[PDB]
Amino acid sequence: QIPKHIAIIMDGNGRWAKQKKMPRIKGHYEGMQTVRKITRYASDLGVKYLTLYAFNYLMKLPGDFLNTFLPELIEKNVKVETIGFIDDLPDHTKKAVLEAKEKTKHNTGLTLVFALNYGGRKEIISAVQLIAERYKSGEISLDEISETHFNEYLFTANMPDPELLIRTSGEERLSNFLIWQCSYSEFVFIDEFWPDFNEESLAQCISIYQNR
Amino acid sequence: NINAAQIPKHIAIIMDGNGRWAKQKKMPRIKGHYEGMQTVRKITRYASDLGVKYLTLYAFNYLMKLPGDFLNTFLPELIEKNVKVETIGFIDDLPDHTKKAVLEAKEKTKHNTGLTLVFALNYGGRKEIISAVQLIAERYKSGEISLDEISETHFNEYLFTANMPDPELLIRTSGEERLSNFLIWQCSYSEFVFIDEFWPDFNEESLAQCISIYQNR
């Protein structure tokens, strides 16, 4: 019935403000508010994993969201995780991330995942490198290099493939996001910019997924 | 629709809805297959005229003989139309009947220089990537390549589409908004166009429409 894993490529924060004739900081503010509302709603719906990918300012959104609403996440049993090369992020951003993961590592509710400094192809390349290492070492046989064991070398090793993939602001591209993981996912593209995405908007996407 | 440098070099299509098209038209499923085959010929001609350089088609025990026989009957026209036939997938594991038709089609068109028509037969996105990993793992164990040589740059060399540009446009019919384990690595930045009509009803206008949309109108 309800998807266990929903992934969202979010953007349109800049365009939203431009069209609305408001400063960037205003779109940034609403953007964070949307992340908060969607996180609570998904948790209530019973969703288990929610992966967010913010496609300058959007670069600050994750860190800013975590530093500002962590107490709320802790309260609502949300566990924070990430995918991507986090050790290469700006210090103050890396700080917020590490702190959020540490303080939510024991929560058992919805796992909120932020894709930071992430890329589908590079993720694949990294896995290949690891697999090559193990093979040359004799740890595995050439027969063990199957699509069943491949997920074990990806960032999403401890999580299921998204049943549903959503992208805002119209745009109909994958943008090098979750290449291997979304190979069978349902793609739902909506025209609304991120700041306008709400609970109702999310239900429609799920409705579509279900009714198909 | 701007015919200029706005025409995609590589268009990939996931052919769907041959069966559903037949049931609606209250006809046997086999008739949907043939109407869909006719659609393949129409589009190949049209695409060739538009200037498209690559066209990859992905279909989505007589059934095992259908792909091979379609080629045998279409080959004469492909030859004179200057179309070059290619394939992606493990054709080596295809039935002798179809394996033969395929190998003959590539041989008799290898010198053509117009549109390159690619048939995804016995193809799987994940499986393709796994095959490339094994090749690379073997090359690494043998000591022929260094760990640093395993980059996104060199990865295309181990895929079936090594000598091909990633598609700029990917189309799927039957209004089913979902990627089906097809050109996983190659479609990272491709534009997706999900059209509602069934493959048998898909035509030149539909293709033109998709391209118009690709051109961001």
Curated annotation (Swiss-Prot), chain A:
**Cofactor needs:** Mg(2+)
Q: How is the cofactor bound?
A: Binds 2 magnesium ions per subunit.
Q: Any idea what this protein is called?
A: Ditrans,polycis-undecaprenyl-diphosphate synthase ((2E,6E)-farnesyl-diphosphate specific)
Q: What is the effect of changing E163Q?
A: Decrease in activity
Top-down, what is the taxonomic lineage of the species of origin? Bacteria, Bacillati, Actinomycetota, Actinomycetes, Micrococcales
Q: Which PROSITE patterns match?
A: UPP_SYNTHASE
Chain positions recorded as substrate binding sites: G12, N13, G14, R15, W16, R24, H28, R167, R173, L174, S175
Effect of altering E171Q?
A: Slight decrease in activity
Q: What EC number(s) are associated with this protein in UniProt?
A: 2.5.1.31
GO cellular component assignments:
cytosol
Homology family: Belongs to the UPP synthase family.
Q: Which residues bind Mg(2+)?
A: D11, E186
**Main EC class of this protein?**
transferase
The GO annotation for biological process reads:
polyprenol biosynthetic process
Gene3D superfamilies recorded: Decaprenyl diphosphate synthase-like (3.40.1180.10)
Q: What does this protein do?
A: Generates ditrans,octacis-undecaprenyl pyrophosphate (UPP) from isopentenyl pyrophosphate (IPP) and farnesyl diphosphate. UPP is the precursor of glycosyl carrier lipid in the biosynthesis of bacterial cell wall polysaccharide components such as peptidoglycan and lipopolysaccharide.
Swiss-Prot record, chain B:
Q: Where is the signal peptide?
A: none
Reactions performed catalytically: 8 isopentenyl diphosphate + (2E,6E)-farnesyl diphosphate = di-trans,octa-cis-undecaprenyl diphosphate + 8 diphosphate
First-tier enzyme category under EC: transferase
Q: What is the effect of changing E176Q?
A: Slight decrease in activity
Q: Which PANTHER family match?
A: DEHYDRODOLICHYL DIPHOSPHATE SYNTHASE 2, DEHYDRODOLICHYL DIPHOSPHATE SYNTHASE FAMILY MEMBER
The domain section of the record reads: This enzyme shows a novel protein fold completely different from the 'isoprenoid synthase fold' that is thought to be a common structure for the enzymes relating to isoprenoid biosynthesis.
UniProt cross-references to HAMAP family, sorted A to Z: ISPT
What name appears for this protein in its UniProt entry?
Ditrans,polycis-undecaprenyl-diphosphate synthase ((2E,6E)-farnesyl-diphosphate specific)
The source organism is Micrococcus luteus (Micrococcus lysodeikticus)
- Lineage, broadest ranks: Bacteria, Bacillati, Actinomycetota, Actinomycetes, Micrococcales
User: Gene for this protein?
Assistant: uppS
